[PDB]
Amino acid sequence: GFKQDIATIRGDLRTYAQDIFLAFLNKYPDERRYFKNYVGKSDQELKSMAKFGDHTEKVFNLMMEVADRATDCVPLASDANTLVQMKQHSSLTTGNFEKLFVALVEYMRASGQSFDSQSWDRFGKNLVSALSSAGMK
Amino acid sequence: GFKQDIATIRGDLRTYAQDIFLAFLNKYPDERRYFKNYVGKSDQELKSMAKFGDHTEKVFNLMMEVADRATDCVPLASDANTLVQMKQHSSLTTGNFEKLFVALVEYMRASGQSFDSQSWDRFGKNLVSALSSAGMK
Numbered sequence: 001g002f003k004q005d006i007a008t009i010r011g012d013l014r015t016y017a018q019d020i021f022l023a024f025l026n027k028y029p030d031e032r033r034y035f036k037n038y039v040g041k042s043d044q045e046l047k048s049m050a051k052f053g054d055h056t057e058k059v060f061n062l063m064m065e066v067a068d069r070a071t072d073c074v075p076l077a078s079d080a081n082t083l084v085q086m087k088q089h090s091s092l093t094t095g096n097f098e099k100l101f102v103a104l105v106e107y108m109r110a111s112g113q114s115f116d117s118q119s120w121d122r123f124g125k126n127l128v129s130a131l132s133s134a135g136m137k
Numbered sequence: 138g139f140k141q142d143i144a145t146i147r148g149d150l151r152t153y154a155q156d157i158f159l160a161f162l163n164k165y166p167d168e169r170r171y172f173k174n175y176v177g178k179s180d181q182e183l184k185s186m187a188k189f190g191d192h193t194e195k196v197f198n199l200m201m202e203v204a205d206r207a208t209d210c211v212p213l214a215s216d217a218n219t220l221v222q223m224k225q226h227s228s229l230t231t232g233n234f235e236k237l238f239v240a241l242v243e244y245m246r247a248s249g250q251s252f253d254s255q256s257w258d259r260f261g262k263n264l265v266s267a268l269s270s271a272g273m274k
């Protein structure tokens with residue numbers, strides 16, 4: 001279920017963080033504009049960049065944290081607030097987040113591994129609602 | 138489902154409120170000690186007291202509000218905080234609430250009317266967890 005998925009992802013955080021992040025950018029190419037230093041780089045090129053592996057794992061570490069603190073896939077309002085208030089998210093709208101989750105759910109469904117992908121979709125929904133309530137446009 | 142069950146109960150509130158609270162008091166007779174003048178009385182006696190109907194309508198009015206204000210059966214922390222800090226609830230522990238929800242769920246499974254019993258069980262468990270987080274022993 002959802003709790004196991006968090007352990008699956010945590011178990012191999014660097015691989016899943018990079019794989020899901022790349023799936024996001026591949027499904028939604030225009031989202032790369034927010035990561036100005038990843039522009040014009042192949043997957044392998046990105047994986048050689050210290051801050052790619054760092055950015056991504058840390059992004060997903062925090063997602064897992066928010067995920068593990070949620071009850072029935074409902075995140076804490078205080079977690080949603082952190083994500084709104086982070087200056088790296090100043091320009092973002094809830095639309096950017098929804099897209100991360102559509103990509104993540106699609107990745108899960110396509111994987112060999114056995115995710116509770118509809119829980120992740122619901123989590124993505126409850127998080128978007130929370131972001132909006134915390135003042136994200 | 139759950140959200141509809143809220144409307145079902147609200148549509149015949151006094152009847153459901155009394156029936157469910159009687160189911161609770163009959164399953165757990167020793168809960169009568171937290172109340173005044175409840176012991177020694179049959180269901181019909183209770184239902185004809187001046188305060189019994191009115192105090193069970195008010196309990197369930199707020200219970201329905203808490204369920205309605207929930208997301209995926211997860212109540213608001215502020216709603217839990219209210220239930221913990223009510224002066225009328227100063228003798229209580231989370232065990233009192235779980236017993237009420239055990240009885241409520243059993244009532245729903247036994248009735249002719251379609252209730253989403255699994256969801257009410259989840260809600261009671263989630264509320265108990267929220268009452269603990271809010272500081273109830």
Ligand code: HEM
Nearest residue numbers: 031034035055058059060062063083088089092096097100
């Ligand atoms: C649940 C979803 C998200 C979480 C948990 C999250 C978390 C984080 C964290 C922890 C950082 C700081 C990394 C560091 O430098 O130490 C960060 C940076 C960033 N986030 Fe997010 N984020 C999320 C969603 C998004 C989305 C949807 C976008 C937009 C496409 C976005 C854009 C960025 C950008 C541009 C940065 C700065 C780039 C960098 O780290 O060098 N984030 N995010």
Ligand code: HEM
Nearest residue numbers: 168171172173191192195196199200225226229233234237
């Ligand atoms: C989510 C569940 C509950 C809600 C929403 C709730 C709500 C309320 C409300 C609104 C009142 C004031 C009613 C009035 O004065 O007319 C009240 C009183 C009270 N509640 Fe609760 N309550 C809940 C659970 C419990 C439980 C499990 C117990 C103990 C077994 C309990 C014990 C009392 C007592 C002793 C009073 C005051 C005495 C009385 O009304 O006769 N409550 N509650």
Ligand SMILES: Oc1c(Br)cc(Br)cc1Br
Nearest residue numbers: 020021024059060063100
């Ligand atoms: O911040 C994130 C981005 Br941007 C994309 C994906 Br996929 C996951 C996270 Br967390």
